[PDB]
Amino acid sequence: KLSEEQQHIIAILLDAHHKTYDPTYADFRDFRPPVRMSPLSMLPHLADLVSYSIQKVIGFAKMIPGFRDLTSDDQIVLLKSSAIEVIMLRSNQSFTMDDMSWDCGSQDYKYDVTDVSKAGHTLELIEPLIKFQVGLKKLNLHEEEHVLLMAICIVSPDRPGVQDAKLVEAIQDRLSNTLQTYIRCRHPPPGSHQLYAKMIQKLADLRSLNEEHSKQYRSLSFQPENSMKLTPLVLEVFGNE
Amino acid sequence: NHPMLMNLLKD
Numbered sequence A: 001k002l003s004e005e006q007q008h009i010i011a012i013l014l015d016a017h018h019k020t021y022d023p024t025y026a027d028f029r030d031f032r033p034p035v036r037m038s039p040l041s042m043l044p045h046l047a048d049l050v051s052y053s054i055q056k057v058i059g060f061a062k063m064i065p066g067f068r069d070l071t072s073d074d075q076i077v078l079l080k081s082s083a084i085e086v087i088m089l090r091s092n093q094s095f096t097m098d099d100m101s102w103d104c105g106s107q108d109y110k111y112d113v114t115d116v117s118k119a120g121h122t123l124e125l126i127e128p129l130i131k132f133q134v135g136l137k138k139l140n141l142h143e144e145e146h147v148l149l150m151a152i153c154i155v156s157p158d159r160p161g162v163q164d165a166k167l168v169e170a171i172q173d174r175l176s177n178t179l180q181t182y183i184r185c186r187h188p189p190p191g192s193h194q195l196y197a198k199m200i201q202k203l204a205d206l207r208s209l210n211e212e213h214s215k216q217y218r219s220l221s222f223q224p225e226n227s228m229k230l231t232p233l234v235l236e237v238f239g240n241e
Numbered sequence B: 001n002h003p004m005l006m007n008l009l010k011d
């Protein structure tokens, strides 16, 4: 059985996600507009989408049970290293295998491979990112599993610069155990086959995506004319030490 | 330094 504490963890994470993820994508109107006619025409829009998403990921992270017991230093390290991975994870909710795109409610806000190419990223990132999105979709995760996976992603003790690794691991383990118990109690066969193992493999995939994104971000942001198109928060999270 | 992240993370 799920203990009362594990039920509590799931309830909090579900609510946390509901309060930081608007499935009507209403705030997207406030971004610099998408331009699809190179020039890097989709950079301003997608920089804004990333920057917005970092803010939401932070607001989610703050609500993870136990995250509050960490020092601000370790909070910072964990969010800086995980932000791009959690954006990739949370984006799965908009991703559709119908046409391999992220569909955020209208044609203006529907992003395919070519749109992502127009923000300065190459297929070395984009092809594995799409493959990641497909594999994750095909897991058909319950919202409960999805929010737990994002929370486990964030509280990872192996991130460079973590000072109190044991406390981070303890926090993570509580979430991992909740996830494993949830799958056993609430996810019916056959969907549940090796489900936990497959979810953890996604976290490994995310490390490789993170590293490639970092390489490409370093390249993109080296030119002051592209850096100019980013946001202050993106420059701080992706660029600072 | 991460003043924006620290701000957003604040209680």
Ligand SMILES: C=C1[C@H](O)CC(=C/C=C2\CCC[C@]3(C)[C@@H]([C@@H](C)CC)CC[C@@H]23)C[C@H]1O
Pocket (backbone or CB within 6 Å): A046, A047, A049, A050, A053, A087, A088, A090, A091, A092, A093, A094, A095, A102, A104, A111, A116, A119, A121, A213
């Ligand atoms: C609110 C959401 C929506 O699901 C849409 C969304 C999509 C994510 C995408 C599609 C565009 C290109 C993105 C931002 C990638 C970067 C590498 C390109 C700027 C990573 C995740 C991708 C983010 C998520 O935070």
